[PDB]
RNA sequence: CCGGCGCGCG
DNA sequence: TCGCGTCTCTCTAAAATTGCAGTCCCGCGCGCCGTAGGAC
DNA sequence: GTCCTAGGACTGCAATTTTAGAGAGACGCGA
């Protein structure tokens, strides 16, 4: 990783390969390949492993990083913990290697103890197949949970914070959200791991004439992170002097100052090191308030893949990255020629050697997503070792492709934005522009519309494939944290228009950017539809304004004019207010008063929507103990009144609301069967005046304890004691 | 404040009509 | 612009972001602008747990407090010499301009005549008010005053102590 | 503190202290009278509000 | 008005030997739970059905094990402080040294003779006591006489607390107390000890409690259907128990003891006693208390029927007081009301018809629906309810879709913005409820939060926006001419807003208003900036934003208001609100 | 080579579950009324006198941390608590 | 129709 | 022939840490994994 | 394979753990 972005998958390919080096002989103090294949051990449920030589079973790691257990793709994750105590020269890292090895240490005082611990160890988790974003950011997190590590109520307040040690090693950005978060890390793009446990980043040596420094780029641990004077300025600058006293920005021992470049001993040259994967997809970051940079990477890893996917106008470059590193595309292990082609397999042909690659098509995930893959080559082409040969789920022309570009407007639109509502038109609907296939399995004849409603796709275990067009209530976002729910759908004559006369797509209210502060989504916009115009495509790196001021403002303000003049198009850049054009109302067609910033975004639709969240509940099954209404949607279970929401009521004063829905809607067993009575017939529903089932169980328990509860009611007329049947 | 002093706060309580006789 | 961030041990950073969103943050200002948005997901994961707790306890010590009746023939008035808290209160004692009632015992207190009492030179004014109420275990019309919400003077069977201890968490 | 030192017994063990609160009542035979608006939400009664 | 006296209480109580075996009465005598082949339940086990009932009486009936020897119980005695402790006036570790140890306690009764000076609780067994007493007195004679000089174990602390004297322990501590005071940390801490015990001493004398229920005889058993953890517990009670009753052997006193506490409460002990998984196991205060308990889980808070959940949009065609229910979530909360409104227009033959025709999805299912929708309110509720606006009622009425339709109004007081959020809805069933729902929660009576009073239906936003831009006048000065300056008239607001529809005027472009009511335009304070004063009368007073025309020959008063077509409207807007409402009622 | 020396939510939570000088007034207070004062004129004045400054005190305190921040809270809610 | 672990949403 | 500080404990009054007990927002969704051990 | 089979963080508080205060019975030295 010297001169390249290292493969987002190398810290868990070596840590593997260095468990096979040392770690299996320095716990024995020949290995088999495995005769299942790894299509087979998900395909019936069997674990990924190799014969040890017969001692055991040893796991093998994919290409990707990804171990199988029981048909289960499973990954095992990095951990933080003590070797300034929140100085990162005072951790270590732990990888798969050490936790293998480990394993082997009890496992040797082996097919039974590895079986467990892939199923039960907190640092191995199912992989998510959500997306390809997905598949590769879950392998690169960093922990400090785990056995030996610190519980969020063990978290002391001063963990969880950045420290500077972090800077090039692990993102300031990306953490988990709620009690875990500051825990829960992420490594950054050009971060490796070190001999000694500790993270490194490679950092760009200036040194003096009388020296040979063959290699001027190096990595440094955080120990002698400290004890180097590191800039992150440019040499863009010169005064009657010379450049040696130019003075720019420049970290050491923990602090920020402002040194002349003689002083400076390493730079930081490389564009994404301080990221990670899912900060590092943001176009024009830099513009982006922090804040929502966190939750734009959240959001981008519940990206559903489309059922036709497209490349974005504006992205990083860091796309064609992930597109290579997730193994979604199918990558040629040799070099030869393309003979045949077809959605079953790609036949290639190379130095008498000729091979059949097979394609995936419409295969399930572990979040019920569909996987597919299409031919990215023809016959008679020549192909070099490592170049792309087919391009599958959310991944066109080896990029990552996860959303649409559609044509977008920021006004107000008669309320149906309010807030966070998203107003669509009905050609995203008809146009099957968010279109996606959703396949459940359930442990029937091939090919039947079962009535949950689907076609049944596979049969071995059923699977049934849903296609879901977008509808109100679901969630689209864009890479900048700026998510919204749709709210409406209207016909196309009704949205309005452009003065091409061509109506918009999605509607935004302008009033999400102040108070959230991205102004990275007005430039993306923008420069998307600049670049649609031109039929250009644009990968810009962050921190573009390091070149010269406003460099971002500069791009976007020319290609805009560039696509108006070279198109005809006048009011695609408009000299009184760039990036913004008078639009019409598509119901009255006259003119909104103010002109309004329109563009071609990049937008994506997330896994949260509508028929997955919708519960409706009469009666049915209770539990067992507290014969209460069940819990989730999935058993058809009620909804919790707590005791927030019964304070509430006794602040309406509804006495007798509180009452329905703590005894004969909750676990009155008498009293509730009589409602079902009752209200069928229509007949007035009386007072339980008996106790419900959660109080002759706290009864019970009381005497368990040797404590009798008697209730006593002293009539008012005549004192007579009455004591209730509890 | 009510003074530190007692009878200073004993003529606050009646001139705030706290305590009386 | 941005202006100066604060490292996460209270001390502030050497080094402002002179910058705005639109001008774009540099990536030295960036990474500094990184510890408030750190602190802002922290502290949001203890203002919740906190002031829950806190709540919790507030509408537990008056969850019984309930207006049960009209009057409890109380005498003590708490003496006040600001608007605001005036408003809605019942008169715990008559109120005399020369030889002239302007106000009269138990009367609820309008805006008009705590104006009537600022414009003119009147120096004591008595109230009764949760402190001046003969129970700590409910409490009168008389002695709580106004409604807050229904305008008139509070009902009886009211449970104004939940919604006491509702009203203070909620901001928490 | 002062929600520990109520009337009720069944507020008081509700809140905090369960173990606490029931061992030291039912040594004297504690009565709850169920004038509080907690007590008779865990009876399932009617609250007197 | 004499108040409706309501006399209602209830009062826990230590229990008795007696009660446990009332309750009962019906013992456990063995630890087997079930049958390994057949999965019957094992009779006189933990399960068996002649002690509890046919396989409703399994969730209440009781049972309990009749302990060979007495058992403390743990609350009363590990606890801090000892009550045990207390009112027998000794430390705690002699105490604990004597149940938990290999210690004898001499001279535990009194109210029987004895003959031997032995006092105190001798740590080391008596040399004499071991064969001299014994092999001179025989053993029946011996056990005879055994248990009242020297004893140990709960049944020494039972012994103690039977033959109490409560009143002397009473007299007994104010002397004390009284001695203290009449000549400094602990010597306070003393006084504090026997106000203490003198205050214990005292409830039991005027209760129906015996100090001697502290140390358990029976252990009743929870009822199966309650424990379909505990059950393991219960096991090792009859494990050790039965053991002990094999051997009649003091430490298999000891463990029956164990077994007890570690059922009644562990983590009591400093290490709590763990399962063969190194797990500790569940006591029964453990159930009882906790967040996550029976008193702050099962009771404080419920799940209901009735009712459902879906994802919220926003309707800014609603009304203040409806909401849009989605058609599933409308037919699954109403279904009885359907089957109700089905049956009683003769559509359906039965109940069971009923439901298979909703099932069905039939069109006839919806009409029935609306119907019986109309005038039956429903409550919404948002996740964190901070104060009582986190639930409001609403009218339904059926929507396209499987979300929420939510008032743009009520946001606010839910907190609720369209992200993702998610509502909870329930229906009130009972007339009561209905009327409850209808006259006190729904949202045109609850427009002013009770914090503080400010109203909490106020626009916000986009309408703030709207009125705004809709409110700011005309643009004046040098923001309007060129040039230093060295406007139509409208006779009624109608015309202006007329002409502002044909495209005539603008939103801001000054006009003059005839005006034909009183001055009631809210304006600075001011003079007239100029009045022409004619010879014939008549002058013209100008303002800086209205012309006033008077004569000193006539009465007459003329008006004319400069403002733009949309505060006309505004002003027009909430007229017309205010002048619909009248004549709709 | 040098060394130089140089210059909300949990304080009202505080407060609730419990000024300089209102523990300096109490503890002035306590040891003057009652050798001033015997029979329950000693008790019942220094009872009245203690807790008549605590509640102003205790208000005070808890409606300026709100104010602080903006909150807007009735003197009646905050006096139902601290009665 | 029972509990733990992990991941999420508001 | 006792008398005198006093040797050697000696028993308890009065702080001084110190080891538990108690608690630490609410409401939803999804997945996985249990239920172990040993002589046949 | 397996069939029965037996480690935060803050507050509260009583509980040691001394520190100290006096202090006395038998006494080796001594007047
Ligand atoms: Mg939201
Ligand atoms: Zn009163």
Request: hydrophobic share 40%; with cysteine.
């Amino acid at each position: 990783g010297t001169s390249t972005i290292p493969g987002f998958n190398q810290i868990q390919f070596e840590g593997f390969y260095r468990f096979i080096d040392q770690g299996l002989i320095e716990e024995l103090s020949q290995l088999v390949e495995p005769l299942i294949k790894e299509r087979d051990a998900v395909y019936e449920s069997l674990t990924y492993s190799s014969e040890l030589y017969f001692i055991g079973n040893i796991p093998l790691m994919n290409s990707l990083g990804t171990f199988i257990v029981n048909g289960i793709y499973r990954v095992v994750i990095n951990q933080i913990l003590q070797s300034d105590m929140n100085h990162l020269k005072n951790k270590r890292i732990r990888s798969v290697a050490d936790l293998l090895q480990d394993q082997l240490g009890l496992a040797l005082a082996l097919t039974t103890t590895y079986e467990s611990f892939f199923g039960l160890h907190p640092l191995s988790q199912v992989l998510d197949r959500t997306n390809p974003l997905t598949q590769i950011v879950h392998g690169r997190k960093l922990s400090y949970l785990g056995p030996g590590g610190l519980t969020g109520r063990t978290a002391n307040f001063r963990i969880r914070d950045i420290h500077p040690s972090h800077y090039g090693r692990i993102c300031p950005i990306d953490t988990s959200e709620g009690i875990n978060v500051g825990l829960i890390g992420s490594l950054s793009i050009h971060a490796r791991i070190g001999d000694w446990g500790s993270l490194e980043s490679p950092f760009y040596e200036l040194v003096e004439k009388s020296k040979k420094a063959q290699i001027r780029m190096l990595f440094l641990s955080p120990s002698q992170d400290e004890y180097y004077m590191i800039a992150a300025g440019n040499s863009l600058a010169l005064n009657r002097g010379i450049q040696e006293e130019q003075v720019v920005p420049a970290r050491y021992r923990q602090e920020f100052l402002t040194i002349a470049w003689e002083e400076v001993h390493l730079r930081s040259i490389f564009p994404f090191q301080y990221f990670s994967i899912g900060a590092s997809l943001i176009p024009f970051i830099e513009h982006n308030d922090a804040n929502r940079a966190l939750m734009s990477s959240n959001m981008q890893r519940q990206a559903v893949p489309l059922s036709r996917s497209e490349k974005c106008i504006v992205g990083t470059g860091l796309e064609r990255q992930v597109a290579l590193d997730s193994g979604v595309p199918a990558i040629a292990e040799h070099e030869g020629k393309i003979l045949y082609t077809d959605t079953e397999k790609i036949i290639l042909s190379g130095n008498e050697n000729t091979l059949s690659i097979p394609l995936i098509m419409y295969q399930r995930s572990n979040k019920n997503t569909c996987m597919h893959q299409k031919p990215q080559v023809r016959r008679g082409k020549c192909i070099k070792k490592g170049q792309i040969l087919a391009d599958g789920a959310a991944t066109v022309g080896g990029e990552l492709a996860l959303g649409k570009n559609v044509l977008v407007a920021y006004m107000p639109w008669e309320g149906y934005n309010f807030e966070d509502a998203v107003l669509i038109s009905e050609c995203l609907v008809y146009g099957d522009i968010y279109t996606s296939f959703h396949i459940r399995k359930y442990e029937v004849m091939l090919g039947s519309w079962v009535e949950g409603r689907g076609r049944v796709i596979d049969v071995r275990r059923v699977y049934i494939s849903q296609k879901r067009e977008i509808k109100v209530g679901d969630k689209v976002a864009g890479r900048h944290g700026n998510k919204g729910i749709i709210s409406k759908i209207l016909p196309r004559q009704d949205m309005p228009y452009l003065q091409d006369g061509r109506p918009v797509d999605m509607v935004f209210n302008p009033l999400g950017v102040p108070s959230r502060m991205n102004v990275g989504q007005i430039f993306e916009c923008s420069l998307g539809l600049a670049g649609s115009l031109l039929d250009r495509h644009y990968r810009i790196a962050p921190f573009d304004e390091r070149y010269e001021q406003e460099a971002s403002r500069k791009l976007v303000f020319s290609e805009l004019y560039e696509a108006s003049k070279q198109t005809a198009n006048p009011w695609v850049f408009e000299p009184e207010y760039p990036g913004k054009s008078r639009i019409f109302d598509g119901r009255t067609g006259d003119p909104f008063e103010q002109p309004v910033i329109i563009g071609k975004p990049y937008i994506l639709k997330l896994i949260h929507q509508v028929d997955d969240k919708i519960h409706g509940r009469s009666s049915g099954h209770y539990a067992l103990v507290t014969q209460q209404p069940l819990r989730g949607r999935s058993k058809q279970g009620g909804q919790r009144v707590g005791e927030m929401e019964v304070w509430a009521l006794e602040g309406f004063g509804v006495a007798h609301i509180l009452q329905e829905m703590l005894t004969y809607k909750s676990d009155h067993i008498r009293a509730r069967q009589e409602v079902l009575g009752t209200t069928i017939i229509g007949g007035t529903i009386p007072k339980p005046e008996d106790a419900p089932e959660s109080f002759r169980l706290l009864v019970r328990e009381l005497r368990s304890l040797a404590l009798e509860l008697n209730h006593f009611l002293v009539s008012e007329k005549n004192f007579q004691i009455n004591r209730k049947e509890v | 404040w009510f003074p530190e002093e007692p009878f200073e706060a004993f003529k606050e309580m009646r001139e705030r009509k706290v305590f009386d006789v | 612009m941005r202006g100066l961030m604060s490292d996460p041990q209270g001390q502030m950073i050497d080094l402002p972001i002179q910058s705005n969103l639109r001008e774009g943050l540099s990536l030295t200002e960036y990474i500094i602008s990184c510890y408030g948005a750190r602190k802002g997901v922290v502290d949001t994961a203890v203002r919740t747990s906190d002031a829950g707790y806190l709540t919790r306890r507030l509408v537990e010590v008056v969850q019984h407090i309930v207006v049960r009746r009209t009057d409890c023939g109380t005498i003590r008035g708490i003496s006040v010499s600001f608007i605001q808290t005036l408003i809605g209160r019942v008169l715990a004692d008559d109120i005399y301009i020369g030889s002239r009632c302007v106000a009269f015992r138990n009367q609820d207190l309008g805006i008009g005549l705590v104006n009537r009492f600022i414009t003119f030179g009147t120096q004591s004014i008595s109230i009764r008010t949760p402190f001046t109420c003969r129970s700590t275990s409910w409490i009168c019309r008389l002695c709580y005053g106004r409604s807050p919400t229904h305008g008139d003077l509070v009902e009886l069977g009211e449970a104004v102590g939940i919604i006491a201890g509702q009203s203070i968490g909620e901001p928490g | 503190r002062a929600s520990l030192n109520t009337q009720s017994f069944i507020s008081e063990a509700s809140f905090q202290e369960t173990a606490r609160v029931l061992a030291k009542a039912a040594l004297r035979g504690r009565i709850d009278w169920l004038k509080g608006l907690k007590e008779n939400v865990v009876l399932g009664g009617v609250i007197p509000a | 008005m004499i108040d409706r006296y309501k006399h209602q209480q209830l009062r826990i109580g230590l229990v008795s030997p007696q009660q446990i075996s009332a309750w009962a009465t019906g013992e456990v005598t063995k630890p087997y739970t079930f049958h390994y082949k057949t999965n019957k339940p094992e009779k006189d086990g933990l399960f068996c059905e002649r002690i509890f009932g046919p396989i409703r009486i399994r969730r209440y009936q009781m049972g309990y094990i009749k302990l060979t020897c007495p058992v403390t119980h743990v609350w009363y005695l590990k606890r801090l402080p000892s009550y045990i402790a207390n009112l027998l006036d000794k430390p705690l570790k002699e105490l604990e040294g004597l149940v938990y140890c290999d210690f004898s306690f001499a001279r535990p009764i009194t109210k029987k003779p004895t003959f031997l000076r032995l006092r105190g609780s001798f740590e080391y067994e008596i040399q004499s006591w071991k064969y001299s007493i014994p092999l001179f007195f025989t053993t029946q004679g011996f056990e005879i006489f055994r248990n009242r000089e020297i004893s140990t174990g709960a049944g020494a602390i039972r012994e103690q607390l039977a033959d109490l004297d409560l009143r002397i322990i009473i007299e007994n501590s104010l002397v004390e107390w009284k001695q203290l005071g009449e000549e400094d940390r602990k010597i306070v801490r003393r006084k504090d000890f026997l106000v203490r015990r003198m205050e214990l001493a005292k409830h039991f004398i005027r209760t129906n409690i015996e100090p001697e229920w502290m140390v358990l005889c029976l252990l009743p058993v929870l009822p199966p259907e309650l424990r379909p953890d505990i059950n393991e517990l219960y096991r090792r009670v009859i494990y050790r128990n039965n053991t002990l009753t094999d051997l009649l052997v003091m430490c298999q006193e000891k463990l029956v003891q164990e077994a007890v506490d570690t059922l009644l409460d562990n983590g009591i002990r400093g290490q709590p006693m763990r399962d063969g998984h190194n797990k500790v196991y569940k006591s029964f205060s453990d159930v009882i208390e906790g967040k996550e308990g029976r008193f702050r889980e099962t009771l404080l808070g419920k799940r209901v029927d009735y009712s459902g959940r879906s994802v919220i949009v926003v309707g800014p065609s609603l009304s203040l007081h409806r909401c849009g229910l989605p058609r599933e979530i409308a037919i699954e909360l109403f279904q009885t009301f359907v089957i109700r409104g089905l049956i009683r227009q003769h559509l359906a033959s039965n109940i069971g018809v009923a439901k298979s025709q909703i099932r069905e999805k039939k069109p006839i299912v919806w009409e029935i629906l609306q119907e019986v929708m109309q005038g039956h309110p429903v409550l919404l509720n948002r996740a964190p309810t901070l104060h009582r606006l986190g639930i409001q009622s609403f009218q339904p009425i059926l929507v396209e879709g499987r979300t929420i339709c939510l008032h743009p109004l009520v946001c606010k007081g839910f907190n609720a913005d369209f992200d993702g959020d998610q509502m909870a809805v329930h229906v009130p069933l009972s007339l009561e409820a209905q009327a409850e729902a209808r006259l006190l929660m729904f949202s045109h009576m609850n427009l002013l939060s009770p914090a503080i009073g400010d109203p909490i239906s106020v626009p916000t936003q986009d309408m703030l926006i709207g009125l705004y831009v809709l409110t700011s006048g005309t643009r004046r000065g040098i923001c309007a001419n060129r040039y230093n300056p060295c406007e139509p008239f409208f006779c009624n607001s109608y015309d202006a807003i007329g002409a502002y529809r044909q495209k005539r005027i603008n939103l801001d472009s000054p006009l003059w208003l005839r005006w034909q009511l009183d001055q009631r335009v809210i304006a600075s304070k001011e003079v007239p900036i100029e009045v022409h004063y004619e010879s014939f009368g008549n002058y013209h007073e100008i303002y800086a934003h209205y012309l006033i025309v008077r004569s000193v020959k006539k009465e007459t008063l003329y008006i004319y208001i400069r403002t733009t077509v949309g505060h006309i409207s505004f002003y027009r807007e909430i007229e017309e609100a205010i002048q619909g409402f009248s004549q709709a009622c | 080579l040098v060394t130089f020396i140089y210059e909300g939510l949990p304080k009202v939570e505080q407060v609730l579950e419990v000024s300089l000088n209102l523990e300096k007034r109490i503890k002035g207070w306590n040891r003057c009324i009652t050798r001033i004062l015997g029979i329950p004129w000693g008790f019942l004045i220094g009872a009245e006198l203690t807790i008549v400054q605590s509640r102003i005190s205790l208000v005070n305190k808890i409606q300026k941390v709100y104010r602080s921040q903006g909150v807007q809270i009735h003197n009646r809610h905050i006096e139902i608590i601290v009665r």
